[PDB]
């Protein structure tokens, strides 16, 4: 029904933007899709009514992708890093969501990355500490 159609549409939108930015990074063309769309998409990802459908449809995979390094090893613009970590903090994420998505692995990297801003590192650390609770029930 409608809530699944909405969530699947948003998932595809995030996938398409990621693929295009990654292709453009390899090609040497501007890779501005994430930055141009992050505010809008992040607002939708915050919807409490959409949340469970989004998690059920594997949206953590696309969030992880958007936080991951570009093909040339560079990181996404810090505005993306900050806003997506803010999104993740708001979601009721449980063990099964984390195991299937692996989003913990990129957030873990943010928490230890020496190049990262102190603020983003601290945000990631807090998110790792929150999700560590899912290990202990």
């Amino acid at each position: 029904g409608t809530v699944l159609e909405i969530s699947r549409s948003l998932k595809k939108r995030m996938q398409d933007i990621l693929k295009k930015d990654n292709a453009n990074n390899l090609e040497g063309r501007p890779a501005t899709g994430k930055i141009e769309n992050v505010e809008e998409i992040s607002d939708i990802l915050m919807s409490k009514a959409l949340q469970e459908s989004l998690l059920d449809e594997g949206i953590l995979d696309e969030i992880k992708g958007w936080l991951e390094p570009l093909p040339d090893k560079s990181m996404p613009n810090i505005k993306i890093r900050k806003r997506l970590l803010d999104v993740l903090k708001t979601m009721k994420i449980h063990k099964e969501h984390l195991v299937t998505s692996g989003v913990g692995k990129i957030v873990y990297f943010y928490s230890i990355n020496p190049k990262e801003s102190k603020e983003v590192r601290a945000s990631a650390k807090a998110l790792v500490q929150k999700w560590t609770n899912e290990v202990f029930k």
């Binding site: 991951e68 390094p69 090893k73 990181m75 063990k95 984390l98 195991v99 692996g102 913990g104 692995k105 990129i106 873990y108 990297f109 230890i112 990355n113 020496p114 190049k115 790792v128 999700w131 560590t132 899912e134 290990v135 202990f136």
Partner: peptide, 24 residues
């Protein structure tokens, strides 16, 4: 608590910090 088993679940989730080391 069996901490060995908790650690194994911790690794399923967070891996071992190696995943993106290539970046540095």
């Amino acid at each position: 608590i069996d901490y060995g088993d908790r650690d194994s679940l911790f690794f399923e989730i967070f891996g071992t910090g190696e995943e993106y080391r290539y970046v540095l």
